[PDB]
Write a protein that binds this ligand. Structure first.
Ligand code: ZN
Length: 93
């Protein structure tokens, strides 16, 4: 299902934040890991443990939850943590 994570090995926040040990980019690693992302080890590429959606080319001080909702609104981890109202608002500008 979409209710199960694509990468269960990254389902723990502690595991995700660990992948950002070598993170030099201007996007907050705690916010990234909170939003479900872990680092792939190539540039600023990250992937969501649940939906598998990848993001790259981050702008400085960008909001990871906003980008998660912008590009991958069907993610069930995004839904659980942020709710449908938030996802809809992101797409209403
Ligand atoms: Zn996701």
């Amino acid at each position: 299902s979409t209710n199960l994570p694509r990468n269960p090995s990254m389902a723990d926040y502690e595991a995700r934040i660990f992948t950002f040990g070598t993170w030099i980019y201007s996007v907050n690693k705690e916010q990234l890991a909170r939003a479900g992302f872990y680092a792939l080890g190539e540039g600023d590429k990250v992937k969501c443990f649940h939906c598998g959606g990848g993001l790259t080319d981050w702008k400085p001080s960008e909001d990871p939850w906003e980008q998660h909702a912008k590009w991958y609104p069907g993610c069930k981890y995004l839904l659980e943590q942020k709710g449908q109202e938030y996802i809809n608002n992101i797409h209403l500008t």
